[PDB]
């Protein structure tokens, strides 16, 4: 009779359509709750995210209106997709919960960071994030907010991002959650405004990572992580500052100068393999890169199309890979009950 049962999982309760089954908790972010299911239909396993109440604040709708979207329109296969997306309540006015059914990956790169990387593995997973970023970029979005805990991997390796990043306005919150600032562009945080590149910085920071196996530029707020930028990176040339507001100019050109390490200093031999020529080599392209990177003038650092042409990179260049046919416009402020419908017939397509 009814094509909907409920169960508890880890504290939420997740009602879904009966095709999936044996429900298991496999995470929780910000958005919602997650879990890994049965498909009976396709059979195979898939990713279930739960967003409770998301049209309950302007932050959540936004976030979750514009996710649903994208995820939808945007085709890559680096790029998440949807599977199925569903909510069990019946009319507008009952409406509370969706269900978004994704693939089913095995790990966060996060935990793939901790772990000891040969080179093929890295500069294949960094191929594939330049290939999401680009495939972003030409669809007219550009991330921002690119992280290690929002892009998963499979054990072959295969890579996919999850979330297409900040609002162009941009906020407030009331559940207790960190948002993770660590891998944001120096344009992001000092408030300069950005082109595409500014995601290459984070990729930066991700491959460093993979490297040194510690978080280049923590901090409790942007003022330590800037701190943390300009002590390894030291400070910036004056062309660069020329470019920022009067008052962030003054904060910044005041904080104490640092030279700034090398980048042999900073990722020291020592941290590659380096035993055969092979990877003699493709360490020496790899600091290369790195130093490209994580250069804090977006004017000076490479780009995503220079990045995917590197040595380092291009050994996987292919045809239909790189590019494809890619594509209306919202972001705009609403009350809860707006929000509620929009999302409500996004849902029922
Ligand atoms: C036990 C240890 C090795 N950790 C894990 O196994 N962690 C998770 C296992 C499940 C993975 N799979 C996965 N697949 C798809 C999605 C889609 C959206 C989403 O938000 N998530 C989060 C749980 C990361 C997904 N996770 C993620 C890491």
């Known amino acids: 009779d009814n094509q909907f049962y409920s169960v508890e999982v880890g504290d939420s309760t997740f009602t879904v359509l009966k ?47 514009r996710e649903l979207v994208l995820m939808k329109c945007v085709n890559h296969k680096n790029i998440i997709s949807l599977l199925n997306v569903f909510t069990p309540q019946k009319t507008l006015e009952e409406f509370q919960d969706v269900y978004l059914v994704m693939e089913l990956m095995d790990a966060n790169l996060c935990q793939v960071i901790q772990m000891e990387l040969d080179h093929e593995r890295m500069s294949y ?22 992280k290690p805990s929002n892009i998963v991997v499979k054990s072959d390796c295969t890579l996919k991002i999850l979330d297409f990043g900040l609002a162009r306005t941009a906020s407030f919150m009331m559940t ?16 300069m405004g950005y082109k595409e590149n500014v995601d290459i910085w984070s990729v930066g920071c991700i491959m460093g990572e993979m490297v040194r196996h510690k978080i280049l530029f923590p901090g409790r707020d942007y003022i330590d992580q800037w701190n943390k930028v300009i002590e390894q990176l030291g400070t910036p040339c004056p062309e660069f500052m020329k470019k920022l ?3 962030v100019r003054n904060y910044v050109e005041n904080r104490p100068k640092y030279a ?22 493709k360490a020496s392209q ?16 490479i780009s995503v199309d220079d990045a995917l042409q590197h040595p380092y990179i291009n050994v996987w260049y292919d045809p239909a890979e790189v590019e494809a046919p890619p594509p209306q416009l919202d972001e705009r402020e609403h ?7 929009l999302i409500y017939k996004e849902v029922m397509n």
């Open 286 to 301: 790899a600091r290369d890169l790195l130093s490209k990177m994580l250069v804090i003038d977006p004017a000076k650092r």
């Open 19 to 65: 095709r999936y089954q044996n429900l298991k908790p496999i995470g929780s972010g910000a958005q919602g709750i997650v879990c890994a299911a049965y498909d009976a239909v396709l059979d195979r396993n898939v990713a279930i995210k739960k967003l409770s109440r998301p049209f309950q604040n302007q932050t959540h709708a936004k976030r979750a209106y």
């Open 335 to 341: 009350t809860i009950e707006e929000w509620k419908e």
């Open 260 to 281: 700034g390490l090398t980048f042999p200093k900073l990722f020291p031999d020592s941290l590659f393999p380096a035993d055969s020529e092979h990877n003699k080599l």
């Open 125 to 146: 997973l960094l191929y594939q994030m330049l290939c999401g970023i680009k495939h972003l970029h030409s669809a007219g979005i550009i991330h921002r907010d690119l």
């Open 176 to 191: 207790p959650y960190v948002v993770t600032r660590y891998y944001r562009a120096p344009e992001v945080i000092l408030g």
């Open 245 to 247: 507001q009067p008052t």
